[PDB]
Amino acid sequence: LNPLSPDIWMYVLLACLGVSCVLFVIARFSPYEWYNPHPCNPDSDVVENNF
């Protein structure tokens, strides 16, 4: 891991954590990710999660 200087390594770890976290945040605000598992039966509005 010598090629990239130790600065970018920690920058990248923190960036990955931040990007994953903001993706999680936007997942809640998302309109359509709520995808009612097994929509073969629309019987009940079981609005459930992903991401």
């Binding site: 809640r28 709520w34 609005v47 999660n49």
Partner: peptide, 9 residues
Amino acid sequence: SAMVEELRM
């Protein structure tokens, strides 16, 4: 209602 529904879950 939208924020509560998508927040508490």
